[PDB]
Design a protein around this ligand. Structure first.
Ligand SMILES: Nc1nc2c(ncn2[C@@H]2O[C@H](COP(=O)(O)OP(=O)(O)OP(=O)(O)O)[C@@H](O)[C@H]2O)c(=O)[nH]1
Ligand SMILES: Nc1nc2c(ncn2[C@@H]2O[C@H](COP(=O)(O)OP(=O)(O)OP(=O)(O)O)[C@@H](O)[C@H]2O)c(=O)[nH]1
Ligand SMILES: Nc1nc2c(ncn2[C@@H]2O[C@H](COP(=O)(O)OP(=O)(O)OP(=O)(O)O)[C@@H](O)[C@H]2O)c(=O)[nH]1
Lengths: 32, 438, 178, 427, 105, 47, 427
């Protein structure tokens, strides 16, 4: 049984999640 | 190819068969000689006429019709008249006696010895028939003689063939007008002997044909000539799909499916909107929205029925001339949005639409206008209870007194037929009604 | 939890087929979980299902009739009843859910993905003809991760078979649970 | 080499295949007769995508027309480009359908499938390698469905390795013309969803609406609407037959588009279509293209995924472009609409760029989208079924043809499956 | 009878020139279930057990008004002088007028 | 150019509209009735 | 780049849009067709801040126009410039407002809000970087007031970072044409105060008084009145689109003008107006331009700022000047009346020096002031409000729309609070 490596936080993780989050900003601005 | 047969029974019929073919030669450009002018379309009888004629190397178009009558008068008249050289002498079948307003006289006393010739001529045309989609059978209900005869010959052809269409036209009993006290009898007899083999029967009331003929035709002394041009225009409209092309095309089998929901009932009603004179039209406009509204005005139906008290089950709209699907669908949407019209909760859609580029024609001496848009509306609705209700109450009272029984029993029938007819119509009332129940 | 929670409530007990569970200890199950049944109805129940297989209460038929079994149709989409009656008719193995404890244990897969398996049956060229081979039956069950022990195979074989091989209609299986 | 044979069914298929073939012929610049005018060597070379050679420089289209009523085909023959099609691929029936799906599906097709299979496989052998076929047809319009059901049914196992692309017209939500069209529709869509890979759904109401919004001409014909749809046809088919830094294979597109086997329904797009004054009132640049194309109203299939959320989007542009403007536009629209796309998958957008435009306009495009905007179409049709089969109205004919309500019930169950399947994944 | 979608400017009394509103339309329905079993026989005769709207329909004092301020008792009378006419409150195109207004003090 | 919206159809005076019968079945096969046919209302074919 | 999107609402904006756009166009020297002629290199450079550039030197005005009465639209269409506007932007309706605030705020706009927001979003995306928008309307007129009240409330949450400047004509202190006008005004200002950052007050009476005092020309036109107000608007926008050692930004101006968020109304002012002979009897110099700018007669918004005391001022000087002379001019007036200036802040003037003049006069200027001179308008409108509401007359239409007076309560209360806070600060 090989243990899957703890997905290394090469930074990113929730940080890159918030990064892409703060570009995904225009939600409604073309069709309401 | 795309072709059908034409059948006319009775003095009641050869009338308007004459009218119809009188028209049908004009728009296609035939001279009453029967040979085409210096221009060239003659041959084995295959050009647009071919759906109604076979102008073989003989050189003459021949209508694909049979005129069967019990009485020599009218057939002799039309033989001596104008169009005999077109006409084919013996398919003008004539008899020696009249059914004398007796359904059983027409069904037993005479029917046996002439149906043989009828069917023989039918088959000797059917052999050359190729497409033979269906028939145009013309008869009546308050028939002087044609009623029982048509019923029995229809039985013969319905049992010999059962894989095609049959179209039925009969002037409906005038509500409060009678030319026969035996009219309720012979009508209901035809009804219960034909309810189970026919395909599509459409009605009309010549009282109302008159009533529009002085509402907007603007004559206080019309004639049968005027009534017959109107109805001939109707038949021309229904056959225009065969005769010409367009964006989209529809057929009789589509009619028989789409209009009637169920067996038994197959009795919708017709209407024609732009019935208008040249003098009236001179300074007014014609177009899709108002012609639709006019064709759905409650008093422009030529049979005494109320949209308001009725409820719709089907509508088919047949447009001829120069139109566009845009305003077509716009008008139909307005129709759906209207409130006075009350469709039953059954039909989500309710409208079979067909279009042809070709504007109808006129006839010299004719009294229609020079119109550019034509619509034929065929509707099935619950508004027709009153007709058969009137018929049954009249019949039940005068059968309770049971006169003219002596006539029928003496000629050799009995009352059991009457009993069956009564229970049939008693069924049909609630048949119309619980389907409306929703 | 009328299905899976009660399934585990049944699993808590350990006694044989005929000795399903004592009526007093099933009343103890009631006090562990008060039930949507009425008091007089439960008073009936504790003997109406001790009628069969000893004075023990029959969760055996109780659970499966209440949730799993349905020997009728549904006007409001039981999702198929695709009209088929071949193997439920002969049915050498009369419905005996204790002898059919497999069905007591295989429900979740079907109750969530009958429709993919509903599809899968006809996907093997069934042509709407009804029955289809026992071998294909078994292999497609193993295909979609429905493991099934040989004793369970024999149970359901007797249930949906009397005479010979036959080909057991798919809806003729489905109406059991679905 | 690989090529496409065309299947044209029903009186809508007649319509659109006629205008469509003349469109393609004029696209490659062939006279209505068949004697070629040499202008563009690349378009001369790529003829073999569709055309089989005839001696002395004349070029047949490898298409098969089929219907029942002869007069429709007679009119098509009389049309401006009739002479281009062959007596060989002209075959039809001796009766009319009456738009009776039962009659077409079992009665009449049974005795013409032999000849139609014969002719299509003859053309297949005449050719060398095939990707698949495309059929043009209706689903509520009777005859086309009544034949195409069996057509696809057989061709499915005749070639389990090819691509069965189909274009069908869809009933109008406001007025469906033929009353039995819903019944015909469900009967078709069962086998359609079971068999096909891809399906294109369009309706004529939206075409009306685009006509009034940009054509402004108030007096079009069904032929003009066919012109639009056949232009979209050609637009998607462009890449195979032309050089460019982009992929062409219908498979290369489908594998990107469809995530799960049950998804087979797709939803078109068109590029700046120019009104009377907009010719000189539009600034023709890629940003405003991107906008006008991916406008919600600019869509024309059924109804706006405005309610729902986009799953996959593909766009093929045609003309002299650069990559970076479309790149920045893709990122702009991606940020512009994140909710309408699913965190399920980012970068659900695929593009392609082919160099040669159509003739006369500078840069154009064609859009295709798969989103959660189709639920309501068959939702609609499903309420019609629940309402009219509530009383077996108009069903005696089908009973007489020999059918049973079974056949309808399995279809309704399948369609419910699809509806729930959408809603579940998209949420 | 149900409404269309999105393209909601080209289908209105704006083009009917209607001045009596058409019908309450909608785009609002959940996924219906049921195989739609059959309760008719050959004609539209429902089977007796299953119910229908059993022929509930089978087949001038009114004036749109805002109460605003007209003498209180007259307003109370006007309420009835508007209603108590189900014949012109029920059906046959609905035949339904509205009300607005404020009480007195 | 034949781009969409470039066809302003010949929607001017069109009195005749009759359609020929360009195809038939005949005996027991199907083929094209003798080639020489008018077009729409008397049109002339290609060459 | 930072640009503007221009909005016209109501049957006043109907004219002001025409006059203002023709002012900009003939200032930039483009023919009534739109084909550009190179005259002023620099204005050609900066044209992008207002116009978009089509192909071939054609220039659309990014103006969006809304109305319910299409006849005035017909007039604007017919005018000598109307052909310059795009049909892509003419959003309107089918009926009129009936000059009812309740109707124009709830019923008729409910079905045009969609399209108006769609056009504005299209243009907002099309453009690059926005400072904000300018809205021409009239609080005294119904239709524009209703549409404006709705649209500004929406755009506040749409784009919460920008400058939503509004210009309007407050009704006459002597006769208001419209009789329910005070209701219209109160309900309009109730949302005006919350939403707008800046609003200009103008009065047609004061325009008439200007015509009497300086124009002397007897027979004017409403077009000429619009000419004067267009001069004012052009003046306030002069700074952005040209070079110069001055701070153009409207936000420059806003933070420099407004001490607190409850102060948004401002009073226009224009520079030398000459009579028929004063052109050649008036030696044109800085001290006399300044003196005429600071007149009890030049000022034309509502009434003399004599009653109250000034709070702040901003002046823009357009032409060839030096800065020192304006410096000692403000010194002179500062010492001249240091008593009328507030003691909260010293030296309350912002001066800006635009270089390129208006064509026709060497030097020019413009004035925008904020003083304790609004009490008159709002007090008077308050008494008229209370008087006509002391028997709730004309309330029947509003209640018939569905409107109750509970809202009027907080409306009138808010105007009372604004006046009271004015008093509290200035005294
Ligand atoms: N077809 C047709 N019907 C007409 C005409 N004029 C009146 N009618 C109606 O058609 C019916 C004609 O039926 P009958 O008079 O019984 O004709 P018949 O049954 O063939 O036999 P006869 O008694 O000899 O006339 C009448 O009831 C009229 O209401 C007409 O010219 N043609
Ligand atoms: N050429 C042509 N086709 C059209 C036109 N308008 C509509 N169509 C479509 O053609 C559709 C169906 O094509 P087919 O499959 O050939 O029709 P079908 O099977 O014979 O059944 P029907 O629609 O009843 O004719 C119809 O439903 C129409 O929607 C048109 O104007 N011209
Ligand atoms: N176009 C135009 N507007 C004028 C004229 N004279 C005065 N106005 C002003 O235009 C103002 C209102 O413009 P809108 O916002 O369009 O008015 P509205 O919403 O239609 O309401 P009403 O003013 O009652 O018509 C009024 O307050 C008038 O003072 C004129 O001659 N032409």
């Amino acid at each position: 049984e090989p243990p899957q490596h703890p997905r290394y936080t090469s930074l990113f993780r929730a940080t890159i999640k918030n990064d892409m989050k703060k570009f995904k900003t225009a939600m409604k601005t073309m069709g309401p | 190819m795309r072709e059908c047969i034409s059948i006319h029974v009775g003095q009641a019929g050869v009338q308007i068969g004459n009218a119809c073919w009188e028209l049908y030669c004009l728009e296609h450009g035939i001279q009453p000689d029967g040979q085409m002018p210096s221009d060239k379309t003659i041959g084995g009888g295959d050009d647009s006429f071919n759906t109604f004629f076979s102008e073989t190397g003989a050189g003459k178009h021949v209508p694909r019709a049979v005129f069967v009558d019990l009485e020599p008068t009218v057939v002799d008249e039309v033989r001596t008249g104008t169009y005999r050289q077109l006409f084919h002498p013996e398919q003008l079948i004539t008899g020696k006696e009249d059914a004398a307003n007796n359904y059983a006289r027409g069904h037993y006393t005479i029917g046996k010895e002439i149906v043989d010739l009828v069917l023989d001529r039918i088959r000797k045309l059917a052999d050359l028939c190729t497409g033979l989609q269906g028939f145009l059978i013309f008869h009546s209900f308050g028939g002087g003689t044609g009623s029982g005869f048509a019923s029995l010959l229809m039985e013969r052809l319905s049992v010999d063939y059962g894989k095609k269409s049959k179209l039925e036209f009969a002037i409906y009993p005038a509500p409060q007008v009678s030319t026969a006290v035996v009219e309720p009898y012979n009508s209901i007899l035809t009804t219960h002997t034909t309810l189970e083999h026919s395909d599509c029967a459409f009605m009309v009331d010549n009282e109302a044909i008159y009533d529009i003929c002085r509402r907007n035709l603007d004559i206080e002394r019309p004639t049968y000539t005027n009534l017959n041009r109107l109805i001939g225009q109707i038949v021309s409209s229904i056959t225009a799909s065969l005769r010409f092309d367009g964006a989209l095309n529809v057929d009789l089998t589509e009619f028989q499916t789409n209009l009637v929901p169920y067996p038994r009932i197959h009795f919708p009603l017709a209407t024609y909107a732009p019935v208008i004179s040249a003098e009236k039209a001179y300074h007014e406009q014609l177009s899709v929205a108002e012609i639709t509204n006019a064709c759905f005005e409650p008093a422009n139906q030529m049979v005494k029925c109320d949209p308001r008290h009725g409820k719709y089950m089907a509508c088919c709209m047949l447009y001829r001339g120069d139109v566009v699907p845009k305003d077509v669908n716009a008008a139909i949407a307005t129709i759906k949005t209207k409130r006075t019209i009350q469709f039953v909760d059954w039909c989500p859609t309710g409208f079979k639409v067909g279009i042809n580029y070709q504007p109808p024609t006129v006839v010299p001496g004719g009294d229609l206008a020079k119109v550019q848009r034509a619509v034929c509306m065929l509707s099935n609705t619950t508004a027709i209870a009153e007709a058969w209700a009137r018929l049954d109450h009249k019949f039940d009272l005068m059968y309770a007194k049971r006169a003219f029984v002596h006539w029928y029993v003496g000629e050799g029938m009995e009352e059991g037929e009457f009993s069956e007819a009564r229970e049939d119509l008693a069924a049909l009332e609630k048949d119309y009604e619980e389907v409306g129940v929703d | 939890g009328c299905w899976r929670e009660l399934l585990r409530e049944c699993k808590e007990k350990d006694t044989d087929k005929q000795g399903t569970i004592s009526a007093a200890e099933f009343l103890a199950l009631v006090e562990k979980f008060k039930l949507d049944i009425s008091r007089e109805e439960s008073q009936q129940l504790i003997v109406k299902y001790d009628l069969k297989n000893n004075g023990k209460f029959a969760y055996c038929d109780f659970i499966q009739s209440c949730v799993l079994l349905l020997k009728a149709k549904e006007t409001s989409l039981m999702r198929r009843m695709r009209i088929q009656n071949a193997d439920k008719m002969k049915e050498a193995g009369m419905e005996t859910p204790s002898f059919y404890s497999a069905l007591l244990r295989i429900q979740p897969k079907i109750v969530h993905c009958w429709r993919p398996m509903r599809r899968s049956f006809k996907t093997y060229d069934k042509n709407g003809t009804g029955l289809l081979s026992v071998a294909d039956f078994r292999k497609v069950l193993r295909q979609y991760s429905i493991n099934l022990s040989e004793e369970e195979f024999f149970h359901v074989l007797e249930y949906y078979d009397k005479s010979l091989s036959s080909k057991i209609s798919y809806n003729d299986f489905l109406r059991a649970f679905l | 080499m690989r090529e496409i044979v065309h299947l044209q069914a029903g009186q809508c298929g007649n319509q659109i295949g006629a205008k469509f073939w003349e469109v393609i012929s004029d696209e490659h610049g062939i006279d209505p007769t068949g004697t070629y005018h040499g202008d563009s060597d690349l378009q001369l070379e790529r003829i073999n995508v569709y055309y089989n050679e005839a001696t002395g420089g004349k070029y047949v289209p490898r298409a098969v027309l089929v219907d029942l009523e002869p007069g429709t085909m007679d009119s098509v023959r009389s049309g401006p480009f009739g002479q281009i099609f062959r007596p060989d691929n002209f075959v039809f029936g001796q009766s009319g359908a009456g738009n009776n799906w039962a009659k077409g599906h079992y009665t009449e097709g049974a005795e013409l499938v032999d000849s139609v299979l014969d002719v299509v496989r003859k053309e297949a052998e005449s050719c060398d390698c095939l990707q698949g076929f495309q059929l043009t047809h209706s689903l509520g319009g009777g005859t086309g469905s009544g034949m195409g059901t069996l057509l696809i049914s057989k061709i499915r196992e005749e070639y389990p390795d090819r691509i069965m692309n189909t274009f069908s017209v869809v009933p109008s939500p406001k007025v469906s013309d033929t009353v039995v069209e819903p019944y015909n529709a469900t009967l078709s869509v069962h086998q359609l969803v079971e068999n096909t890979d891809e399906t294109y759904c369009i309706d004529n109401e939206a075409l009306y609406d685009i006509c009034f919004r940009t054509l402004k001409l108030t007096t079009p014909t069904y032929g003009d609407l066919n012109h639009l749809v056949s232009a979209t046809m050609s637009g998607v088919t462009t890449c195979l037959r032309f050089p460019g830094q982009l992929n062409a294979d219908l498979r290369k597109l489908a594998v990107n588009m469809v995530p799960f086997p049950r998804l087979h329904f797709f939803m078109p797009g068109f590029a700046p279509l120019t009104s009377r004054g907009s010719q000189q009132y539009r600034a023709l640049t890629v940003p405003e293209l991107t906008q006008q194309m991916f406008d919600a109203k600019n869509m024309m299939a059924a109804c706006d995924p405005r309610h729902g959320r986009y799953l996959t989007v593909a766009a093929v542009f045609r003309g002299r472009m650069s990559m970076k403007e479309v790149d920045e536009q893709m990122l702009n629209v991606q940020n512009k609409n994140s909710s309408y796309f699913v965190e399920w998958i980012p970068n659900n957008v695929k593009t392609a760029v082919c160099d040669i435009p159509p003739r006369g306009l500078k840069m154009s495009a064609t859009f295709i989208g798969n989103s959660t905007a189709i639920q309501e179409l068959f939702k609609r049709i499903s309420e019609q079924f629940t309402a009219m089969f509530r009383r077996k109205a108009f069903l005696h004919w089908y009973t007489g043809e020999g059918m049973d309500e079974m056949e309808f019930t399995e279809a309704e169950s399948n369609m419910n499956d699809l509806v729930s399947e959408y809603q579940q994944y998209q949420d | 009878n149900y409404s269309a979608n999105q393209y909601e400017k080209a289908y209105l009394p704006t083009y009917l020139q209607n001045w009596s509103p058409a019908r309450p339309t909608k785009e609002k329905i959940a996924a219906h279930e049921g195989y739609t079993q059959i309760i008719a026989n050959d004609r539209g005769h429902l089977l007796p057990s299953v119910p229908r709207s059993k022929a509930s329909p089978w087949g001038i004092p009114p004036a749109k008004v805002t109460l605003t301020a007209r003498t209180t008792t007259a307003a109370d009378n006007l309420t009835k002088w508007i209603h108590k006419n189900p014949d012109l409150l029920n059906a046959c195109n609905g035949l339904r007028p509205e009300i607005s207004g404020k009480p007195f003090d | 150019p034949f781009l969409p919206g470039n066809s302003f159809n010949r929607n001017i005076g069109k009195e005749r509209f009759h359609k020929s019968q360009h195809w038939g079945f005949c005996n027991n096969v199907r083929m094209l009735v003798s080639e020489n046919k008018p077009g729409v209302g008397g049109d002339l074919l290609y060459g």
